[PDB]
């Protein structure tokens, strides 16, 4: 409080000296969902090339 | 991986053996795989007939060649060896062997069948 007001003597009353807000605990992957790929094991594991 | 040799056993001279190798567990549409025939007289050394690669490479014992035709059913999984015009010194044990891959180059005849005896005979 002395900070805010810059004082070394506050005076009686009330004063708003800061904000909090918690802060998140965890992230969450990021992700849409899958399915399906292309054709590799097609490319690469032909029979005849 | 197995395989299995059928057709006629006794035959007249002068007549055609046939013989059909049906396997279980390799199909003639991989790369390296191929199918071959290979007779040994009883008591005697062994003897190459035929073979076929499987991008369908007819390689022939060339002494044995005009004489012989090997064909393929894949479908029936199955290969087909002809050979006309039989005689007594043909009695023999015929196998059908396989060759396929290894792990740094082309393996042949890994595996046998099991031999169908052949007389030539009356």
């Known amino acids: 409080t002395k900070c805010t007001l810059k004082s070394f003597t506050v005076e009686k009353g009330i004063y708003q000296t800061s904000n909090f807000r918690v802060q998140p605990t965890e992230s969450i992957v990021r992700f849409p969902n899958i399915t399906n790929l292309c054709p590799f094991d097609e490319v690469f594991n032909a029979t005849r090339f | 991986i197995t395989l299995k040799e059928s057709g006629l056993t006794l035959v007249r001279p002068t007549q055609t053996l046939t013989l059909t190798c049906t396997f279980s567990?390799?199909?003639?549409?991989?790369?390296?795989?191929?199918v071959g025939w290979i007779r040994q007289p009883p008591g005697k050394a062994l003897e190459w007939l035929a073979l076929i690669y499987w991008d369908d490479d007819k390689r022939y014992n060339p002494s044995l060649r005009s004489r012989l035709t090997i064909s393929k059913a894949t479908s029936k999984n199955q290969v087909v060896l002809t050979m006309t015009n039989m005689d007594p010194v043909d009695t023999a044990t015929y196998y059908c062997?396989?060759?396929?891959?290894?792990?740094?180059?082309?393996?042949?005849?890994?595996?046998w069948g099991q031999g169908a005896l052949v007389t030539v005979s009356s």
């Open positions: 567990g390799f199909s003639l549409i991989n790369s390296g795989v191929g």
């Open positions: 062997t396989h060759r396929g891959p290894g792990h740094n180059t082309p393996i042949y005849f890994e595996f």
